[PDB]
Amino acid sequence: FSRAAMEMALRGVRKVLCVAEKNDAAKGIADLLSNGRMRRREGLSKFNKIYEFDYHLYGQNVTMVMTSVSGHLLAHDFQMQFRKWQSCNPLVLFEAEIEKYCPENFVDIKKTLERETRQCQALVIWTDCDREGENIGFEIIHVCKAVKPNLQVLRARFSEITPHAVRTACENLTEPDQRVSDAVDVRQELDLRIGAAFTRFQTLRLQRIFPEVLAEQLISYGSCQFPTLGFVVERFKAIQAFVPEIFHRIKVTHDHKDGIVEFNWKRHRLFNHTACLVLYQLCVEDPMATVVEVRSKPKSKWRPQALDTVELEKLASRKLRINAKETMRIAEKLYTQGYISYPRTETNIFPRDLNLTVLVEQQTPDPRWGAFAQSILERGGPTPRNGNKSDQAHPPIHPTKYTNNLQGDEQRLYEFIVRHFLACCSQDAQGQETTVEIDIAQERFVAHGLMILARNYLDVYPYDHWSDKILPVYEQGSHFQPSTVEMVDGETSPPKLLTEADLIALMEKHGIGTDATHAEHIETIKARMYVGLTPDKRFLPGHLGMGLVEGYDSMGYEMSKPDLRAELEADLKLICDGKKDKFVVLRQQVQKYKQVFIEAVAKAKKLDEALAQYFGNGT
Amino acid sequence: NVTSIALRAETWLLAAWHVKVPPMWLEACINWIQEENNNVNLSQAQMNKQVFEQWLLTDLRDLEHPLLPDGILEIPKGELNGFYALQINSLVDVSQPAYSQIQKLRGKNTTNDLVTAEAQVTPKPWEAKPSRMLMLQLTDGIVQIQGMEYQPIPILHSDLPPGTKILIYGNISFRLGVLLLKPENVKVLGGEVDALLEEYAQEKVLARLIGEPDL
Ligand SMILES: [Ca+2]
């Protein structure tokens, strides 16, 4: 814990084995700590290199042996006996013994870690600082502790790959968190058991019932992919059920030199022809408009709130037309290359420790946003718009280094992250709102006006729009003849099919897909052909996707609802905080899902009946 | 012979509530109230109350006693003056879509149906509202006209039972068989009609406006 305790622990350490999540992170972290002085060496894996370099750890000169893994080193599965589909009843998979093993393609990495452990006295985990990263860290620990059981294990915590961050990580090494690793082991186990039991049950059943339609096809089940599909089917059904209605409104317009002024009815609209016809007839006879109230007040448009993973995933889809899976891929590439902070965070509050003034200064060399960044500094400095969430691990996603060398979508997302950051650190747009109320035969109509005085954050954030709506001068008490007095018709519009940002919003609202896993589950229902994208590009459910959701929902228990997964994901967060143990969560979640399974097997014919609506007869 | 009590009740009904009733119904009604309270000799005050309570529960369509002036539907526009104790057969809000209304009434949750990623475009207080407009189907039992909430009348609400008796008074401008009612022109007397509760229940009224079958 203390500096004296650490220095004492480090005594007699000559070689320190360091392990990163991927080779590019290993090459990157080693290059920064060594100042490019690192010496490359070969591992037993051709894609996972060793970078030796001299470094000073807690007052001890050591040789840092920096290598990497390639994501998860260990695979989880049932024993060989339960692995074959025709070897057991899917119900036994809720209790069937599960084992962790190293795949053939990763054995070279496992053997490199083991090899280096022999020459090293300490182990430092440099995997990304998220739940999966801590679990990968514990996979590396288990492999090395098999060689040296008394090996000193430390954990480097960092939110960016920059010289200051990686140097501070070395001065503040901590203990690896078993709690967050355990939550990953619990989720991995539940996903395998619920996944396997329900997949084997429905795939085998539906392949026997509909052989011509679902031959050799995999009808997979996921505890999270199912309520995700549920949102898409729920919205489609909402549109299907929606009844549009004709409404009527009195439209009064008044012509001016360079623009027509439209006064909007204070009664807004009526769903009755005779009700509106009567009020309109009153308006044609004596249409003399009198200015009742000419009111004006200051109006403001708020600058964006500090950026988190969800807002990035949604805004990149809406504003840049990059899908969440690609956004997270590019965002991870920019993070690894040192241009942005860790893009997997729930934080929308800038920590007090973080120097925003430097981050803004750093962006002043840019031709496009440079002048604006300078403008923040000239106006006193950065004034961020913070939210209410903090994971207490990472800061909001922000630019950590300036680069002009990016291309394609990589440039587009970096530019977005920079502009959002500067907009957030800027001021709100300030305008003047004006309103003119007119009376025509005791009927009140209102025209609105806007005059933006200071655009502020809008000058760097083109993704948001604010436009002047300048109204002519109307004196309180004036009388005038309107250009036209009409009785126009309208109709109510149904909802639209969900976009990816719309689907992420629903997932967020209901607490599923937490820990930035939204994209993974949206991608699974896309890939399994349960949903399809329209040209618009919105989610349309397929016949199999549709049939499964209305099949399980007809069984009584509302299975398409995200309530059970949200409870599961909630329990996982408790394991991380040490607020709940892994054994109670496992026993409770397994009992809950085994019950839902047993009820579904009992009413299995409901699945056949729901899909028969699309594929016809079948036995 | 209850004709002496009938004149006294007729005087009171008109004086206190502007209720006009046919002599035959009134006499038949008094006789029934006398049979119901056989054990006692009721006062005129108690008789007047019980007669009025029976009136509130009576279907004006079955009363055959015209109240509203002749050809009120024949005149395109005009003004109506005087006191009328009419009956609401059905009632609906025309400021809100019937589909939106039936959904809320049916208690089904449509939260996820209005979820979008697009930023909250804060509406104006008459778009965030707008003020309610009830369209009443009023009758004297012979002629059927419409009553519009021209100005907010808070005593009226969509949940008023079909057959509810209401006093329509003062100067009221009317157009195309629609009365432009202001709060100062309406008074709710109460009551209900069993025969109407069935057919013109708010669920059934709205279901008809969205084309639901078997109605
Ligand atoms: Ca990762």
CATH number belonging to the domain at A177-242+496-619, selected among 1.10.150.670, 3.30.410.40, 3.40.190.10, 1.10.460.10: 1.10.460.10
- Cα B70–chain centre separation: 20
How large is the C-alpha radius of gyration of chain B?
21
- Contact status, residue A226 vs residue A195, Cβ threshold 8 Å: no
Distance of CA A312 from the midpoint of ligand 1 (Å): 17
CA distance A506 to A500: 10
The one-letter amino acid at B24 = M
Query: B residues 124-153 near A, CB within 8 Å?
Result: 124, 126-127, 129-131, 133, 135, 146, 148
User: Which residues is B90 bridged to in the sheet?
Assistant: B137
Q: Which residue of A has its CA nearest to B109?
A: A238
CB within 8 A of B132, min separation 6: which ones? B93, B95, B96, B149, B152
* CA pair distance A111, A43, nearest whole angstrom: 9
Sequence-ordered list of residues with C-beta below 8 angstroms from that of A522, at least 6 positions apart, any chain = A228, A324, A325, A500, A503, A504
Mapped onto helix, strand or coil, the DSSP state of residue B144 is: strand
Report in angstroms the alpha-carbon separations of B123 from A103, A284, A439, B133.
58, 28, 21, 20
How far is Cα of residue A439 from the mean position of the Cα atoms in its chain? 50
b/e per residue A453-469 (b: at least 16 CB within 10 A): eeebbbbbbeeeeeeee
The CA angle A576-A582-A583, to the nearest 5 degrees, is: 165
Nearest to A191 by CA among A71, A76, A344: A76
Q: Which of B109, B213, B99 is nearest to A243 (CA)?
A: B99
Query: How many Cβ atoms are within 10 Å of A104's Cβ, its own excluded?
Result: 7
* A104 HSE (CA, 13 A, CB side): 0
Other Cβ atoms within 10 Å of B148 Cβ, number: 23
Question: CB of A373 within 8 A of CB of A399?
Answer: no
- Residue A473 token pair: 């001068």
What are the chain A neighbours of B177 within 8 Å (beta carbons)?
Answer: 274
DSSP state of A515: T
What is the nearest CA distance from B136 to chain A, expressed in angstroms?
A: 11
Q: How far is B135 from chain A (nearest CA, A)?
A: 8
How far apart are the C-alpha atoms of A462 and A205, rounded to whole Å? 53
B115 → closest Cβ in A281, A492, A506 = A506
Residue type for A103, please? P
Question: Is residue A341 within 8 Å of A308, Cβ to Cβ?
Answer: no
Evaluate whether A76 touches A98 at the Cβ level (below 8 Å): yes
Q: How far apart are CA A468 and CA A485, in angstroms?
A: 26
Using CA atoms, how far apart are residues A123 and B5, in angstroms rounded to an integer? 107
Q: How far apart are CA A337 and CA A365, in angstroms?
A: 19
Cβ atoms of A239 and B64 within 8 Å: the answer is: no
B171: left (phi over 0), alpha (psi -120 to 50) or beta: beta
Is-contact A230 A549, C-beta < 8 A? Answer: yes
User: Residue A502, SS3?
Assistant: helix
What determination technique applies here? Answer: X-ray
C-alpha torsion A224→A227→A232→A238, nearest 10: -170
Helix (H) or strand (E) holding A319: none
- Choice among A55, A335, A342, A593 that is catalytic: A342
For residue A342, indicate whether it is catalytic: yes
d(CA A597, CA A190): 13
Shortest alpha-carbon distance between residue B32 and chain A (Å):
43
**SS3 state of residue A290:** strand
- The structure tokens listed for A252 are 């009064």
Size of interface A-B (CB pairs under 8 A): 89
Structure tokens given for A291? 């200015």
Q: How far apart are CA B25 and CA B5, in angstroms?
A: 13
**DSSP string computed for A60-100:** EEEEEEEEE--S-S-EEEE-HHHHSGGGS-GGGGGTS-EEE
**Nearest Cα to A589, choosing from A239, A3, A90, A186?**
A186
Listed residue (B51, B12, B16, B17) closest to B33, CA to CA:
B51
Contact check, Cβ <8 Å, B99/A267: no
CA angle (B76 as vertex; B71, B77 as ends), nearest 5:
105
SS (H, E, C) A229-262: HHHHHHHHHHHHHCCCCEEEEEEEEEEECCEEEE
Neighbours of A561 (CB within 10 A): 16
Residue indicated by tokens 């004297």: B140
Structural element, H or E, at residue B40: none
Which residues lie below 8 Å from residue A430, measured CB to CB, with a gap of 6+? A298, A299, A300, A452, A453, A454, A456
Instruction: Give the residues across from A296 on adjacent strands.
Output: A434
CA B181, CA A409: separation in Å to the nearest integer? 63
* Class of CATH domain A303-427: mainly alpha
SS3 A133: helix
Strand partners, A393: none
Do A309 and A495 form a contact (C-beta atoms < 8 A)?
Answer: no
> Which residues touch A616 (CB under 8 Å, ≥6 apart)?
none
* Angular region, A538: left φ>0, alpha ψ -120 to 50, beta rest: beta
Domains by residue range for chain B, with CATH: 1-58 (1.10.8.1020), 59-215 (2.40.50.770)
Cα atoms found within 13 Å of the Cα of residue B137, Cβ hemisphere only: 19
The dihedral region occupied by A514, where left means phi > 0, alpha psi between -120 and 50, and beta the remainder, is beta
Residue A495 with chain B: CB contacts under 8 Å: 113-114
Distance CA A382, CA A462 (A): 19
Could you give the C-alpha distances from A509 to A49, A406, B112, in angstroms and in order? Answer: 43, 35, 9
Closest CA to A519 of A209, A119, A224: A224
Q: Do residues A408 and A401 make contact, with C-beta atoms less than 8 angstroms apart?
A: no
- Give the span between the Cα atoms of A526 and A506, in whole angstroms: 17
- Using an 8 Å CB-CB cutoff, list residues of chain A that contact chain B: 231, 234-235, 238, 242-245, 247, 266-272, 274-275, 277-278, 281-282, 314, 317-318, 446, 448, 492, 495, 499, 501-502, 504-506, 509
Alpha-carbon gap, residue B92 to B50, rounded angstroms: 31
Tell me the chain B residues in contact with residue A235 when contact means C-beta distances shorter than 8 Å: 112-113
Distances (CA, A) of A253 to A256, A261, A368, A435: 10, 6, 42, 15
Of A310, A220, A230, give the one whose Cα is nearest residue A514.
A310
- Domains in chain A: boundaries: 1-176, 177-242+496-619, 243-302+428-495, 303-427
Question: What's at A162, amino acid-wise?
Answer: T
Instruction: For CA atoms A17, A21, A26, A30, give the dihedral sign.
Output: negative
Nearest CA in chain A to B102: A243
Q: Nearest CA of chain B to the CA of A269: how many Å?
A: 6
Contact indicator for A29, A166 with CB cutoff of 8 Å: yes
Residue type, A377: L
CATH class of A1-176: alpha beta
* Residue B41 CB neighbour total at 10 angstroms: 6
A332 Cα to the center of ligand 1, angstroms: 9
Residues belonging to chain B? 215
CA distance B99 to A491: 12
CATH number for the region A243-302+428-495 comes to: 2.70.20.10
- A406 by Cβ neighbours in 10 Å (0-12 / 13-18 / 19+) ranks as middle
The C-alpha angle with vertex A71 and arms to A69 and A75, in degrees rounded to 5, equals 105
Residue A20, both tokens: 């990163």
What is the phi/psi pair of residue A30, to 5°?
Answer: -60, -40
- DSSP one-letter string for B74-126: T-SEEEE-S-EEEEEEEEEESSS-HHHHHHHHTT---SGGG--SS------TT
Q: Which residue has the tokens 């006499």?
A: B27
Residues in chain A: 619
Longest dimension (CA), chain B: 77
CA–CA gap between residue A401 and residue A399 (Å, rounded):
6
What's the rounded Cα separation, in Å, for the pair A367 and A419? Answer: 13
| Cβ–Cβ < 8 Å for A296, A434 | yes
What tokens were used for A360? Answer: 């803004």
Q: Which amino acid is at B129?
A: K
Residue B165 contacts by C-beta under 8 Å, 6 or more apart in sequence?
B55, B56, B85, B86, B87, B88, B188, B189, B190, B191
Q: In chain A, what residues touch B211 (CB-CB under 8 Å)? A: 243
Smallest Cβ–Cβ distance between B117 and the set A231, A247, A502 belongs to: A502
Name residue A159's amino acid.
S
| CB half-sphere exposure, A71, CA atoms < 13 A | 3
Q: Which helix (H) or strand (E) holds A298?
A: strand A289-301
How far away, in angstroms, is A84 Cα from ligand 1 center?
A: 30
- State the distance from the centre of ligand 1 to the C-alpha of A221, rounded, in angstroms: 24
Phi/psi class of residue A215: alpha, beta or left (left: φ > 0; alpha: ψ in -120 to 50)?
beta
> In this structure, what token pair is assigned to residue B199?
């057919």
